[PDB]
Amino acid sequence: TPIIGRDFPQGFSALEPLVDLPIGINITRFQTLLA
Amino acid sequence: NTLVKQLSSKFGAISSVLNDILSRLDPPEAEVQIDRLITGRLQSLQTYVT
Amino acid sequence: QIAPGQTGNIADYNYKLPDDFTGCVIAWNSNKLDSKHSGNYDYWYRSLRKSKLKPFERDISTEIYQAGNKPCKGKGPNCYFPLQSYGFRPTYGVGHQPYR
Amino acid sequence: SNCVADYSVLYNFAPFFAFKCYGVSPTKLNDLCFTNVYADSFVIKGNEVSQIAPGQTGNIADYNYKLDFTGCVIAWNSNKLDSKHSGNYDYWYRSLR
Numbered sequence: 204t205p206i207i208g209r210d211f212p213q214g215f216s217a218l219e220p221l222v223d224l225p226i227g228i229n230i231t232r233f234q235t236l237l238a
Numbered sequence: 239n240t241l242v243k244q245l246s247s248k249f250g251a252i253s254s255v256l257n258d259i260l261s262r263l264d265p266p267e268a269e270v271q272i273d274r275l276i277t278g279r280l281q282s283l284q285t286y287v288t
Numbered sequence: 289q290i291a292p293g294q295t296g297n298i299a300d301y302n303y304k305l306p307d308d309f310t311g312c313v314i315a316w317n318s319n320k321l322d323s324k325h326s327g328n329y330d331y332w333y334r335s336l337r338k339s340k341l342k343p344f345e346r347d348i349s350t351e352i353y354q355a356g357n358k359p360c361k362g363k364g365p366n367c368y369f370p371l372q373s374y375g376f377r378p379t380y381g382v383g384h385q386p387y388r
Numbered sequence: 389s390n391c392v393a394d395y396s397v398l399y400n401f402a403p404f405f406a407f408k409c410y411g412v413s414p415t416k417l418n419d420l421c422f423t424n425v426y427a428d429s430f431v432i433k434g435n436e437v438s439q440i441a442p443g444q445t446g447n448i449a450d451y452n453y454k455l456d457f458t459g460c461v462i463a464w465n466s467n468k469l470d471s472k473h474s475g476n477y478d479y480w481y482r483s484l485r
């Protein structure tokens with residue numbers, strides 16, 4: 204989403220589906236990864 | 239009183255109470271019996287409204 | 289047990305199949321290329337689990353099942369291995385033969 | 389008839405080396421009894437315990453009685469009863485058949 208550099212306009216937008224990854228596991232927790 | 243009384247009917251189901259259907263029958267069989275009770279109960283409401 | 293709505297050691301602890309299911313279940317007898325005379329113990333199924341499985345979940349673990357109330361570790365009065373092997377052999381009846 | 393089918397007392401009665409059962413489950417919630425459970429009780433050798441299995445033969449389970457059945461057993465030797473070499477025959481079965 205292109206946005207103004209800092210402030211949110213708090214407008215409306217929507218996301219599109221990209222992928223179905225059938226891992227088939229119990230997911231209860233998550234974390235992000237640093238580069 | 240008639241509309242409430244109809245809730246005790248089975249309409250061919252094994253029991254008029256939904257919890258007995260879920261307790262006694264495997265999910266797909268419970269679904270068949272539930273659709274049967276749903277049909278009977280919604281027909282009772284349409285009769286009442288008409 | 290490989291059908292929507294079924295209950296049993298496989299339907300509940302190894303593979304729950306959805307109730308709203310579209311697809312085909314294809315099965316055939318496989319005594320050939322299996323069921324060696326000495327017992328084919330390469331195939332295992334889960335018999336002990338904490339809870340019933342959700343559709344298509346595959347929880348693959350060797351966690352020791354605690355059957356009793358008193359805590360234990362590894363092996364003991366209340367500690368049982370969760371998987372049960374089955375020795376397929378040519379001498380078993382049809383209900384006890386392997387199927388692919 | 390005043391049965392209940394509380395199986396926690398059987399489990400707690402003695403430790404098991406292994407369950408050695410052909411039908412392990414919680415076995416109801418111990419409040420209500422269902423079906424005629426029955427108990428066909430006898431004492432056999434450690435290898436005979438494995439011989440009596442669904443679809444199995446061996447020497448035992450061809451002689452005596454064939455085992456569809458739940459094999460849940462308190463798999464513990466009553467050493468206090470079998471401590472003598474001459475023992476007794478209180479648990480006999482027709483192994484000759």
Ligand SMILES: *[C@@H]1O[C@H](CO)[C@@H](O[C@@H]2O[C@H](CO)[C@@H](O)[C@H](O)[C@H]2NC(C)=O)[C@H](O)[C@H]1NC(C)=O
Binds near residue numbers: 338
């Ligand atoms: C997915 O994982 C969670 C947590 O690891 C499981 O939740 C536990 O389930 C056991 C068995 O019912 C309970 O004794 C625990 O108390 C639960 N944890 C919590 C934090 O409540 C959950 O059961 C797993 N999903 C499946 C399908 O097994």
